[PDB]
Amino acid sequence: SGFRKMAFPSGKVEGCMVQVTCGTTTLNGLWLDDVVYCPRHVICTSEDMLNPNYEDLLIRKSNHNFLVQAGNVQLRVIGHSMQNCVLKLKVDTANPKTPKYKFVRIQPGQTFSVLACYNGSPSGVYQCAMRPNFTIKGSFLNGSCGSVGFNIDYDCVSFCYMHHMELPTGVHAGTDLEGNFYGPFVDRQTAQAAGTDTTITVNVLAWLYAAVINGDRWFLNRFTTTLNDFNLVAMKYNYEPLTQDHVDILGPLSAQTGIAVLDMCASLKELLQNGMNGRTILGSALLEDEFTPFDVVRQCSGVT
Length: 304
Ligand SMILES: *CCC(=O)N(c1cc(C(C)(C)C)[nH]n1)[C@@H](C(=O)Nc1c(C)cccc1CC)c1cccnc1
Prior knowledge:
Bound molecules: the ligand *CCC(=O)N(c1cc(C(C)(C)C)[nH]n1)[C@@H](C(=O)Nc1c(C)cccc1CC)c1cccnc1
CATH superfamily of the domain at 201-300: main proteinase (3clpro) structure, domain 3
CATH topology of the domain at 201-300: main proteinase (3clpro) structure, domain 3
Order of helices and strands: HEEEHEEEEEEEEEEHHHHHH
Number of strands: 13
Number of helices: 8
Strand order of the largest sheet: 5-4-1-2-3-7-6
Helix content: 10-25%
Oligomer: monomer
Radius of gyration: 22 Å
């Protein structure tokens, strides 16, 4: 019983974090097989950050201008390529701790665990969602760049996120592990705007299911509704509209609790149009959208 924001155990990622140093810029990198992946802005000085020419900047650097360190081990860089916004350094040594891993680009509304690091050392682990506007509400200080987001599927580590920067608004932007930004952001110290953020409706519904399961049923009502009718109310409140795929994904939670998705949608509507009124759900006074239906099931079934 009980319900928490749970992160994946970080063990397998801890063994891939390294410190990367070019000139006087240091940040984190990710050491898999005989390659170190890190944000390409490692090769910028402070002057350069307003309007960097990454091609002209990279042409000045050699293999020996890069210092990769794993704990007290120095690694020797023997190749270097730029792939979009990441830098690949080819090292002499394959990482004995390299896990079963994939690189995955994720979709907005998906959750993952971040291992936040400084100088290639772990400081803490937390779970978060990729916002619909392609930012994350993270916790990152200077030097956290190259911290990664990851999911685990049994013994397989799926890398989905590398942290590149904080926006002037205080939220976080980064790339997949092929160096493509999530969202419309560039790795440039200039003013950039995220879109309007929305609430991830499917995840709110999954959290309501988690609540019922764990005893918390006050908000259940007699009413029901249409998908169309429900989406009209969701839009006025900046909620993501609900598709049939979203209904299909909640089927298991529906079956386990014996509550129709649309009956749960009717319960949600009523909370949008009346708020919580000084009540709580799983000890939150707000609607929580950082658990997917997958997360609720893993946590409420005991998946290792
Ligand atoms: C790892 C580097 C680092 O800590 N930061 C960073 C990113 C960059 C760019 C992408 C511009 C080359 N330069 N330095 C900072 C960061 O992004 N700083 C920042 C902030 C906090 C607010 C507005 C603009 C900028 C950069 C112009 C960083 C990254 C994550 C978390 N805290 C700070």
